[PDB]
Design a protein around this ligand. Structure first.
Ligand code: A1ATH
Ligand code: MTA
Lengths: 625, 309
């Protein structure tokens, strides 16, 4: 359940070294395509004409071996950011040479070091290489958690290490990475190979790499311990970090020599793989939604569109969600009719937006266990789902369920509603126009009628995710505004992200609205205290809803309804990422706008730096009325 | 002669011992098999010729550096992350390994035996410097003072507890295991081009020379920490620095511009040899006559230069 790699910087013979690495239990091998000590001269005339092959044959491995087993390493002497010019241009021509040989071999990944602050000329040559051919190979940048200058032993008399807390200086390696990728314009082929030090840094420094495209974790043999039995082990602190990585499904890579006579590299993995089993399988919600991690989708629009048969099916694969509805109705039924009026007072229940009728059946089970009599209207506008309803009224429901095929805003009802039941809420609560729908349907709800859900609330929280920022950035399509993908929300099971503040309420709607004058236009102004240095990429959205009384449904992480995978969080992006210092406040503003044809969201950032107003006039995203 | 068929192209080090026998260390930096070997030639003129050798064994990985241990022992800085000690037999025909300890996590780049002959210091690309006990095959101390791969370590003469070390963190560290903080940085090279080579002066306890990557050679009085005397000797990284065994030693520099140069006390220039076509890697003067200086290269030549004193 763990994919691991072996980092070597010494191969005498590929086929004999790779065969060794394979038997020990490794999925791939990181090795130098060129001899690490083979400095080559490209300009200077005595040494430019060095004879012989510049490296070993490609024939030493099969085609699929290079494609799936081998991760290239760029030679340690390549220093394109050197202060000496001759070293710069040799490093330039040689970095291109090594990189071009990796693409020649079809290697899936290439390792590049980020061991100093300035890799500007490094980023450049790399970028040109990315923009020469159109390829999909990845580039793993080695960046350690703690810089080599901040880990050195305090054994120099006249240069003692700084014992003070450099809060932003302890995060300095992240700045190496951030500046590198920003120079490379967020190329999808450039990911992080995080090197784990013997002694870990501060918690914020580790938190810094939340949301970053970490494809690999480097585990040197030196950071391992020795249990009472004499085998390599890891501290609880270190183990927690690995557990955190396990959640991102990074590949785990061992580097350095093994100091144990009891030798054998499998033990180092034996403990590592061992850890995966120890991590609890599954987290319940995680099992079902696997493969949807960080997967961008357009939010469903049941009103404007007609949902397919299999999206109604996934809706029903959540009993927990309906139990709350069942219970809310249950509780409500008892409240409205007393025990002596039980068999005389029949209640008009109306499932507005019945779909394939899970709500109508939950309304039936609620009436049975409440021992009160109900007349039930199943109202659905999607003609295709109505076919399921009418087949299921005829076969089993009978005349207790009346199926109505119309829009609830248009539908004239024969009877007034004792209770109306709605499932209209979206990921961001009202993004599915549940307000406008239930509003136009209040007229057939009697004056003391209960609407389920009574209210719902949208929540917002700023997030940091360079991973997710590329995916939106990759969403550009032809025949449309090149930035329109940034001005539209997405429903997505957020995974590799970092929440930057506690979710705050955004919009609220109460049904029945009543009010002399109903207006679903909204202005809400939020301020999010941020206690860490970071980069703002977007705002995650959740919702809480109160079906009736205490019963509720929620995807807000603090009050997340346990065991409910029915809804995913929504993500509002911003065109340009915004850097945020510790102690700064993220002020965001959101608008719910509407005309007579459509409803949309506008949003902007007025915090540390202003951001353009997103989706103005609904130019890039509408919710059709 | 109980030796491998051919040796590898990249001659990486050449050392003379007391009696005049030439030690050779070569690695296969390119090709199918990346390994190394150790060679001894009691005749120095037939050194590049495998069949005309006195001894010859063949090691697992590349020989990044070597040094003599006494008169019948070779300490090896091997690519495999290990330091290796090989020792001739009594007949001096077979070279057998004494130990092979894998303590460095990267290429062992440099190694130097101390004045006591019982200890040796090694530097590697893992930034760690280790103190070795060559009798108990163990590491005496794990020093991690630099922040970049260690380029050169040079044991002090007549001081079994002092040695030099230079890394790509632009630092030169004067070491003394007697002090609580055993390392002492040299403030001269505050903006200096990265140091690449180190050589103590034989006669003086506090005098040593370093070579930077811009081809500049400078000698420093260590005790005074005063302004050094500098001279642009080469056009590439200065690979190594050796002093002649004379009473007034000449300074022989060698760099990646494929040229060997010999200097005096004021670092003036007496002799270049352009004879090498590739990188020059090591220098060792003949102790039998003191005007011969032989240097190897990656062009697989050994060149016996006559140093015109
Ligand atoms: N009116 C509604 N709107 C919704 C909009 N979106 C969603 C929503 O999150 N997903 C539906 C569309 O794919 C994304 C997402 C999803 C995908 C897979 C899974 C799986 F397989 F893991 F379980 C779960 C969720 C749910 C809605 C619901 C209602 C009524 O109750 C549910
Ligand atoms: C389970 S999703 C909620 C259901 O309500 C339906 N729905 C949405 N809006 C309306 C409406 N105005 N009238 C009737 N059904 C609706 C949607 O099509 C969906 O099947």
């Amino acid at each position: 359940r763990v994919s691991s790699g072996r980092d070597l910087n010494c191969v005498p013979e590929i086929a004999d070294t790779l065969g060794a690495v394979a038997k020990q239990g490794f999925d791939f091998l990181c090795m130098p395509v060129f001899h690490p000590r083979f400095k080559r001269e490209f300009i200077q005339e005595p040494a430019k004409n060095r004879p012989g092959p510049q490296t070993r044959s490609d024939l030493l491995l099969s085609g699929r071996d290079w494609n799936t087993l081998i991760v290239g390493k760029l030679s340690p002497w390549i220093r394109p950011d050197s202060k000496v010019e001759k070293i710069r241009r040799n490093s330039e021509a040689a970095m291109l040479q090594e990189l071009n040989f990796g693409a020649y071999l079809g290697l899936p990944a290439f390792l590049l070091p980020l061991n100093q602050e300035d890799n500007t000329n490094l980023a450049r040559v790399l970028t040109n290489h990315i923009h020469t051919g159109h390829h999909s190979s990845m580039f793993w940048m080695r960046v350690p958690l703690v810089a080599p200058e901040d880990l050195r032993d305090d054994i120099i008399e006249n240069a003692p290490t700084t014992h003070t807390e450099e809060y932003s200086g302890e995060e300095k390696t992240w700045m190496w990475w951030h500046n590198f990728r920003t120079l490379c314009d967020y190329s999808k082929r450039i990911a992080v190979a995080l090197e784990i030090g013997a002694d870990l840094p501060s918690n914020h420094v580790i938190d810094r790499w939340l949301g970053e495209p970490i494809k690999a974790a480097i585990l040197p043999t030196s950071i391992f311990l020795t249990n009472k039995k004499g085998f390599p082990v890891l501290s609880k602190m270190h183990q927690r970090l690995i557990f955190r990585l396990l959640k991102l499904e990074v590949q785990f890579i061992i580097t350095g020599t093994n100091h144990h006579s009891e030798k054998e590299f499998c033990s180092y993995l034996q403990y590592l793989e061992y850890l995966s089993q120890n991590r609890p399988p599954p987290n319940a919600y995680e099992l079902f939604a696997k493969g949807y991690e960080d997967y961008l989708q357009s939010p469903l629009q049941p009103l404007m569109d007609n949902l397919e048969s299999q999206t109604y099916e996934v809706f029903e694969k959540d009993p927990i969600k309906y139990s709350q509805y069942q219970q809310a109705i249950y509780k409500c039924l008892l409240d409205r009719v007393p025990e002596e009026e039980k068999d005389t007072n029949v209640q008009v229940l109306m499932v507005l937006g019945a779909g394939r009728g899970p709500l109508v059946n939950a309304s039936l089970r609620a009436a049975k266990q409440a021992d009160r009599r109900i007349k039930l209207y199943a109202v659905e506008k999607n003609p295709n789902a109505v076919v399921t309803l009418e087949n299921w009224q005829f076969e089993e429901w009978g005349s207790q369920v009346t199926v109505v095929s119309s829009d609830m805003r248009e539908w004239v009802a024969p009877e007034k509603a004792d209770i109306i039941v709605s499932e209209l809420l979206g990921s961001f609560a009202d993004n599915e126009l549940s307000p406008e729908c239930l509003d136009g349907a209040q007229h057939f709800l009697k004056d003391d009628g209960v609407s389920i859900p009574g209210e719902y609330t949208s929540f917002l929280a700023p997030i940091s995710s360079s991973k997710l920022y590329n995916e939106v950035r990759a969403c550009r399509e032809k025949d449309r505004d090149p930035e329109a993908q940034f001005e539209m929300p997405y429903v997505v099971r957020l995974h590799n992200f970092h929440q930057l503040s506690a979710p705050q309420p955004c919009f609220t709607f109460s049904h029945p609205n009543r009010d002399p004058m109903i207006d679903n236009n909204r202005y809400c102004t939020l301020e999010f205290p941020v206690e860490v240095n970071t980069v703002l990429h977007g705002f995650a959205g959740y919702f809480e809803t109160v079906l009736y009384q205490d019963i509720t449904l929620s995807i807000r992480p603090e009050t997340h309804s346990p065991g409910m995978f029915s809804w995913f969080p929504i993500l509002f992006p911003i065109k340009q990422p915004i850097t945020v210092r510790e102690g700064q406040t993220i002020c965001v503003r959101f608008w719910r706008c509407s005309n007579s044809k459509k409803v949309w969201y506008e949003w902007a950032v007025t915090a540390p730096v202003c951001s353009a107003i997103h989706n103005p006039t609904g130019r890039s995203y509408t919710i059709g009325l | 002669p109980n030796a491998p068929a051919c040796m590898e192209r990249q001659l990486e080090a050449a050392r003379y011992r007391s009696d005049g026998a030439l030690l050779l260390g070569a690695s296969s930096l390119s090709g199918r098999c990346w390994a190394g070997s150790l060679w001894l030639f009691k005749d120095p003129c037939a050194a590049p010729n495998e069949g005309f050798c006195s001894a010859g064994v063949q090691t697992e990985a590349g020989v990044a550096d070597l040094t003599w241990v006494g008169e019948r022992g070779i300490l090896v800085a091997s690519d495999s992350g290990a330091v290796e000690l090989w020792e001739l037999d009594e007949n001096e025909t077979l070279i057998v390994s004494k130990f092979c300890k894998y303590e460095h996590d990267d290429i062992v780049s440099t190694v130097s035996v101390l004045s006591s002959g019982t200890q040796a210091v090694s530097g590697s690309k893992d930034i760690c410097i280790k103190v070795w006990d060559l009798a108990q095959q163990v590491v005496l101390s794990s020093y991690r003072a630099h922040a970049a791969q260690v380029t050169c370590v040079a044991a002090s003469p007549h001081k079994d507890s002092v040695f030099l070390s230079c890394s790509e963190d632009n630092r030169i560290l004067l070491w003394d295991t007697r002090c609580p903080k055993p390392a002492s940085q040299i403030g001269c090279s505050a903006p200096g081009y990265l140091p690449t080579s180190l050589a103590w002066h034989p006669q003086q306890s506090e005098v040593f020379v370093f070579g930077d990557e811009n081809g500049t050679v400078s000698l420093v009085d260590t005790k005074s920490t005063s302004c050094v005397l500098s001279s642009a000797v080469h056009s590439q990284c200065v690979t190594g620095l050796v002093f002649s065994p004379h009473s007034v030693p000449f300074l022989a520099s060698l760099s990646e511009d494929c040229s060997l140069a010999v200097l005096d006390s004021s670092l003036s220039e007496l002799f270049r040899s352009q004879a090498h076509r590739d990188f020059v890697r090591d220098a060792t003067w003949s102790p039998l006559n003191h005007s011969l200086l032989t240097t190897v290269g990656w062009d697989h030549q050994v060149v016996h230069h006559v140093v015109p004193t």
